[PDB]
From a paper:
The Staphylococcus aureus pathogenicity islands (SaPIs) are the prototypical members of the phage-inducible chromosomal island (PICI) family of mobile genetic elements. Stl is a DNA-binding protein that binds to the intergenic promoter region between stl and str (the SaPI transcription rightward regulator), preventing transcription of the str and downstream genes, thus maintaining integration of the island in the host chromosome. The remarkable ability of the SaPIbov1 Stl to target unrelated but functionally similar antirepressor proteins relies on the modularity of this repressor. In this way, SaPIbov1 Stl presents three domains: one corresponds to an HTH N-terminal domain required to recognize and bind the divergent stl-str region present in the SaPI genome; a second (middle) domain responsible for interacting with the trimeric Duts, while the C-terminal part of the protein recognizes the dimeric Duts.
Therefore, we determined to solve the structure of BovI-Stl by eliminating this region and dividing the protein into two functional and complementary portions corresponding to the N-terminal (BovI-StlN-ter; residues 1–156) and to the C-terminal part of the protein (BovI-StlC-ter; residues 175–267). The crystal structure of BovI-StlN-ter was solved to 1.8 Å resolution and showed a single copy of the protein in the asymmetric unit that presents an α-helical folding, as was anticipated by in silico modelling, composed of 10 α-helices. The initial four α-helices (α1–α4) correspond to the DNA-binding domain, presenting the archetypical helix-turn-helix (HTH) motif observed in multiple repressors, as well other DNA-binding proteins. Helix α5 connects the HTH domain with the remaining five helices that form a more compact helical bundle. We named this portion of the protein the middle domain due to its localization in the Stl sequence. The structure shows that the N-terminal and middle domains are closely connected by helix α5, while an unstructured region of about 20–30 residues connects the middle and C-terminal domains. In the model, BovI-Stl recognizes the DNA by inserting helix α3 of the HTH motif into the major groove of DNA. Our model further proposes that additional residues such as Q29, S44, N48 and R22 could mediate the nonspecific read-out of the nucleotide sequence by interacting with the DNA backbone. The first three residues coordinate a sulfate ion in the BovI-StlN-ter structure that could mimic a DNA phosphate, since superimposition with the C.Esp1396I-DNA complex places this sulfate at the position of a DNA backbone phosphate.
Author numbering: 8 to 153
Write the structure that this text describes.
C-alpha cells in the first residue's frame, strides 16, 4: 500500500532537523539519493513498510512519523513537527527512562502522548526543556503514570 504524500514532507523536515543530506540519509536507509528526493517531493509513493526504514535512518521510531501524520490529518499541520526540537529533547529522556527504569517500562501507556504531557507540564512551570536533566524528568514521568 501507499501513504499520504505528506509523509515526504515530514521526512524532509526531520531530515533537515537531523542535519542530514539526502546522500547521508541514503547511506542510512539504502534508498538511492534520487529516490529520497522523489519521496520528499511526492514523485514516488512511500510504502507502508518503508517508513520503518526511514525511521531507523533518522534515528526515530516510526510511530513518531505516524503520530505526526495523524495531526496533519486532523488540523492541516502538525504542532509537534513545528516544535520538534522540544519534542526531540524531551523524547531523549523518555526513551532513556523507558529502557532503564522498570517502573516506567511496565507503567507507561503511550510514549508519544507521555512526551507531549511532559512538555505541557514544563510549559505550565515556565521551564525550558534545555534546562532539565534526567532525574527531574523521571520524577515528572512517575507522577503522570501514578
Amino acid at each position: 500500500a501507499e501513504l499520504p504524500t505528506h509523509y515526504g514532507t515530514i521526512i524532509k523536515t526531520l531530515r533537515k532537523y537531523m542535519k542530514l543530506t539526502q546522500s547521508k540519509l541514503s547511506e542510512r536507509t539504502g534508498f538511492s539519493q534520487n529516490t529520497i528526493s522523489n519521496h520528499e517531493n511526492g514523485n514516488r509513493n512511500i510504502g507502508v513498510n518503508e517508513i520503518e526504514i526511514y525511521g531507523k535512518g533518522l534515528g526515530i521510531p516510526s510511530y513518531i512519523l505516524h503520530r505526526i501524520s495523524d495531526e496533519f490529518k486532523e488540523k492541516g499541520y502538525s504542532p509537534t513537527l513545528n516544535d520538534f526540537g522540544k519534542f526531540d529533547k524531551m523524547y531523549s529522556y523518555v526513551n532513556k527512562a523507558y529502557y532503564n527504569d522498570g517502573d516506567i517500562y511496565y507503567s507507561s501507556y503511550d510514549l508519544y502522548d507521555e512526551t507531549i504531557k511532559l512538555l505541557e507540564l514544563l510549559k505550565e512551570s515556565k521551564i525550558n526543556v534545555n534546562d532539565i536533566d534526567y532525574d527531574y524528568v523521571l520524577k515528572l514521568y512517575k507522577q503522570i503514570l501514578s
